[PDB]
Amino acid sequence: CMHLMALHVHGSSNPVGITGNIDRLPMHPYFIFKDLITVFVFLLIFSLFVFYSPNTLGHPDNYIPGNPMVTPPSIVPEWYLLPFYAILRSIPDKLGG
Amino acid sequence: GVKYTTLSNGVTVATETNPAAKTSSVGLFFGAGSRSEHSHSNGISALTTNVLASQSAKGSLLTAKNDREFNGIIAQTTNDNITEAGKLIASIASNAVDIVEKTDLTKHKQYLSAQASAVEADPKSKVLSHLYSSAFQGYSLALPTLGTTESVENLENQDSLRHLAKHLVNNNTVIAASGNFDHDKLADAIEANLKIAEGVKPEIKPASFLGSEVRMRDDTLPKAYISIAVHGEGLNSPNYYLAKVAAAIYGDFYLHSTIAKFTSPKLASIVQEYNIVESYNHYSKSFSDTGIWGYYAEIADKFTVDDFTHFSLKEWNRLSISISEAEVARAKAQVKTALAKELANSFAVTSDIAEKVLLVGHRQSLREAFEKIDAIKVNDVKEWGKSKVWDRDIVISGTGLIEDLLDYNRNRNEMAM
Numbered sequence: 020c021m022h023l024m025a026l027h028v029h030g031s032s033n034p035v036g037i038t039g040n041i042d043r044l045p046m047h048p049y050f051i052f053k054d055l056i057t058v059f060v061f062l063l064i065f066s067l068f069v070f071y072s073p074n075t076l077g078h079p080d081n082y083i084p085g086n087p088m089v090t091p092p093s094i095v096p097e098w099y100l101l102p103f104y105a106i107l108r109s110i111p112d113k114l115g116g
Numbered sequence: 117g118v119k120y121t122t123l124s125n126g127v128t129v130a131t132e133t134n135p136a137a138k139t140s141s142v143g144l145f146f147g148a149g150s151r152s153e154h155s156h157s158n159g160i161s162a163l164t165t166n167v168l169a170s171q172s173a174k175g176s177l178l179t180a181k182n183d184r185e186f187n188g189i190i191a192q193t194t195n196d197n198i199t200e201a202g203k204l205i206a207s208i209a210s211n212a213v214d215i216v217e218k219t220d221l222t223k224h225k226q227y228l229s230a231q232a233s234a235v236e237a238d239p240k241s242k243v244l245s246h247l248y249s250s251a252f253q254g255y256s257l258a259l260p261t262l263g264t265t266e267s268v269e270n271l272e273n274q275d276s277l278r279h280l281a282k283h284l285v286n287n288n289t290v291i292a293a294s295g296n297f298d299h300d301k302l303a304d305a306i307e308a309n310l311k312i313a314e315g316v317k318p319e320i321k322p323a324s325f326l327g328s329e330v331r332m333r334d335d336t337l338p339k340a341y342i343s344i345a346v347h348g349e350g351l352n353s354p355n356y357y358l359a360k361v362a363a364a365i366y367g368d369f370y371l372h373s374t375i376a377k378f379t380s381p382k383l384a385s386i387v388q389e390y391n392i393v394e395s396y397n398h399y400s401k402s403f404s405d406t407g408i409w410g411y412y413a414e415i416a417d418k419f420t421v422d423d424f425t426h427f428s429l430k431e432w433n434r435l436s437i438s439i440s441e442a443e444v445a446r447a448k449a450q451v452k453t454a455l456a457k458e459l460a461n462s463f464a465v466t467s468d469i470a471e472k473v474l475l476v477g478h479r480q481s482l483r484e485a486f487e488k489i490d491a492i493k494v495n496d497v498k499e500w501g502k503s504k505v506w507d508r509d510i511v512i513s514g515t516g517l518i519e520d521l522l523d524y525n526r527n528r529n530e531m532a533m
């Protein structure tokens with residue numbers, strides 16, 4: 020909500036990178052329906068993953084009951100934390116990491 | 117005494133002779149307005165009429181009547197001088213081509229261009245003129261009645277002479293009169309003096325309504341001027357009076373009038389909760405076969421244009437639902453009075469009788485119109501509202517402080533719920 024208000028104070032930018040004040044349109048109906056298009060596309064792809072291929076994004080080892088005595092061959096985060104964890108692996112010092 | 121007279125040639129002399137008329141007028145009309153022009157020759161009908169109307173008059177007042185559909189010269193004189201006025205216009209027409217051939221149009225073109233520019237300066241005339249065009253874009257009916265500047269300077273005597281020879285013909289011309297005079301004497305006077313070439317009535321160029329929006333945002337003006345209208349019933353349509361009745365339901369409004377706080381139309385009370393609009397005017401403009409029904413409005417606040425369009429269009433919805441009998445009774449009475457008001461001046465009835473005789477071929481006196489309007493029930497208005505208003509395409513125009521006028525889809529969507 021705070022992000023939305025910080026947006027609303029000055030409004031949203033545009034691809035051209037110039038003032039939108041020359042030509043503004045109400046969010047409804049135009050951009051409401053654009054939001055519906057993107058929402059249905061997102062939900063369709065989300066359905067693909069959820070129903071037809073749910074575990075591809077996840078890691079199989081997470082279905083093994085965890086026990087501290089056994090270390091898996093590769094301790095790795097889910098895909099979308101990888102870019103940051105890579106940095107953590109690259110920096111020698113733990114504090115520096 | 118609405119009686120008609122057909123001369124030896126096909127010219128019809130229609131005269132609304134009536135005792136107790138303050139002054140009398142006679143006018144010759146030929147059905148060639150901006151409708152019968154094209155962009156290259158736009159304004160020629162107005163220019164050729166002004167040249168004829170600029171001719172010296174024997175104490176009579178020659179004035180030019182210019183309109184989308186019909187165009188002619190009108191002479192106004194005291195009741196005793198009507199026959200001289202009648203013989204005058206016949207002299208003008210018989211010598212029309214000769215007058216135009218030698219006439220120098222430069223001064224007349226300057227006057228016409230000044231007229232056209234003055235129309236653009238006045239916001240209401242600009243908005244209405246743009247509104248009519250936007251509805252009929254692509255057809256000749258979109259052309260301004262007086263034309264535009266850049267069009268006018270290209271006019272030449274050949275353009276008008278071609279125009280007159282095409283249109284100023286017996287079958288495409290009518291003679292109108294009104295006042296306290298004997299009909300027969302005027303008819304005989306015209307026959308002995310009017311000599312015009314024969315010709316077939318030029319087919320009226322078709323036009324079709326196209327819902328659209330024309331915005332001329334002008335931030336320097338003090339007020340926002342907007343007009344919104346639909347494809348209203350035009351002349352020779354059985355709903356012609358019905359469209360006028362529907363318009364009178366919402367009527368007129370002016371915020372700084374002593375009647376503002378006390379007027380009947382619902383929209384008037386609604387807009388005063390915030391002084392949304394300074395003035396608005398509902399109208400039913402009717403052409404030969406097409407009409408535009410809507411309102412014009414001037415808004416003196418930048419931040420209330422959307423509020424007005426929302427509320428005004430919401431009020432239109434009530435034509436098809438929850439329209440009250442009292443409103444219809446009010447609108448019927450208001451239209452009847454307004455209809456009779458237009459026909460008071462002998463000049464106005466002369467223009468009116470010429471319009472009907474050209475564009476519909478017959479005319480209804482106030483007696484017939486009152487019999488028709490009196491028979492309009494609430495159901496007839498509601499059926500019309502659904503036919504011509506409910507979810508029907510609108511046409512939008514606006515010039516000043518338009519920034520707050522929300523785009524088409526918003527206003528158009530308000531036409532249905």
Ligand SMILES: Cc1cccc2c(-c3cc(C(F)(F)F)ccc3F)nn(Cc3nnn(C)n3)c12
Pocket residue numbers: 094095096097098099100101103104
């Ligand atoms: C399984 C695993 C191994 C190594 C690191 C991580 C992280 C991780 C967490 C953070 C933060 F401090 F933000 F918590 C920052 C960087 C990281 F690499 N997380 N995980 C499990 C996981 N990965 N992705 N998800 C949805 N959970 C790891």
